[PDB]
Design a protein around this ligand. Structure first.
Ligand SMILES: O=C1c2cc(-c3ccnc(N[C@H]4CC[C@@H](O)C4)n3)cn2CCCN1[C@H](CO)c1cccc(Cl)c1
Length: 327
């Protein structure tokens, strides 16, 4: 039987992984489910084709290094990696992960979440996030489609492609605090089943944020260092703050108090992940005895940003060597 294929794309993961089914895609790859004939379960397989671009090579190496270091129930792991036997033939990398049933994006398109389920999902996000940040890592792309759910409401954070040592993007960007902003956006979306700040572009993103939080204070204002952005915000008329209980009339007041502290304009006054876990909203789940941290911070021994993509390819080849037969 020849090399496998999905939607006209080579997906060369047999003989161990067969019965492929398309799930989704990324900027330079594709995810499928597959049958693993060793473990006799279906798994997810992420195909990545980074090697034409230094940036993609950087992200791929970081993602692999980070996930191989991490071990945590609320974080997707790596079970296996397939690539060609020689660097000259390596044009893709296949990362094998636990297959999850659905994600929060799909769930919120079709289901109303009870306050208890919102609470339990938020708790799991933050528990996962506490571990990540404790490793001195930023996820940088938290959003509902990167939060995976299995049948029994277990949540796992995936896609560490942008991890480092528009709708979900913090105002700063336009630090660990940017992840908390994202989580706030996700909480708001769990409350209403719609994105809280659905901007079409950069400027429009800001306008939506300002439409809810009101015009920035002057101390707030010099969080925005970009001079184009600063003058733009100065150019706008005054905007009144909309109270959270007016935006989410049927929401738990404890949930809104926490939301308020996550969606704080000034990153320095935004709640941190441990404080958030300790908030009264999450009291029913908070268990500081059972919220592990990383044994030590993560650190790159090479800065990856400066390396030619050929050297990065070599590092990716070496990094993945451990999963090769007879290694
Ligand atoms: O990394 C991932 C990723 C891996 C999975 C995943 C893993 C295990 N289990 C399920 N289960 C799914 C079944 C149905 C569905 O709702 C949940 N999904 C979901 N994602 C999120 C979207 C796709 N990416 C990123 C982009 O974001 C990516 C992929 C490929 C190449 C590149 Cl460059 C980037």
């Amino acid at each position: 039987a020849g090399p496998e294929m999905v939607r006209g794309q080579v997906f060369d993961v047999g003989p161990r992984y067969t019965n492929l089914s398309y799930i989704g895609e990324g900027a330079y790859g594709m995810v499928c489910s597959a049958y693993d004939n060793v473990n006799k379960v279906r798994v997810a397989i992420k195909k990545i084709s980074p090697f034409e671009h230094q940036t993609y090579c950087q992200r791929t190496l970081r993602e692999i290094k980070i996930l191989l270091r991490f071990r945590h129930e609320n974080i997707i792991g790596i079970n296996d990696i397939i690539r060609a036997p020689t660097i000259e033939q390596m044009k893709d990398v296949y990362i094998v992960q636990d297959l999850m049933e659905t994600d929060l994006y799909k769930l919120l398109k079709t289901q109303h979440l009870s306050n208890d389920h919102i609470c339990y999902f938020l708790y799991q996000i933050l528990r996962g996030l506490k571990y990540i940040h404790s490793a001195n890592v930023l996820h940088r792309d938290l959003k509902p489609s990167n939060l995976l759910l299995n049948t029994t409401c277990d949540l796992k954070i995936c896609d560490f492609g942008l991890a480092r040592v528009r709708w979900y993007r913090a105002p700063e960007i336009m630090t660990k605090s940017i992840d908390i902003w994202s989580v706030g956006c996700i909480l708001a979306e769990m409350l209403s089943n719609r994105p809280i700040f659905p901007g079409k572009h950069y400027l429009d993103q800001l306008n939506h944020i300002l439409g809810i939080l009101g015009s920035p204070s002057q101390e707030d204002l010099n969080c925005i260092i970009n001079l184009k952005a600063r003058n733009y915000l100065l150019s706008l008329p005054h905007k009144n703050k909309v109270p959270w209980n007016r935006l989410f009339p049927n929401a738990d007041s404890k949930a809104l108090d926490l939301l308020d502290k996550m969606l704080t304009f000034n990153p320095h006054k935004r709640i941190e992940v441990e404080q958030a876990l300790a908030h009264p909203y999450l009291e029913q789940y908070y268990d500081p005895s059972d919220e592990p941290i990383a044994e030590a911070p993560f650190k790159f021994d090479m800065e990856l940003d400066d390396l030619p993509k050929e050297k990065l390819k070599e590092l990716i080849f070496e990094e993945t060597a451990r999963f090769q037969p007879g290694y």
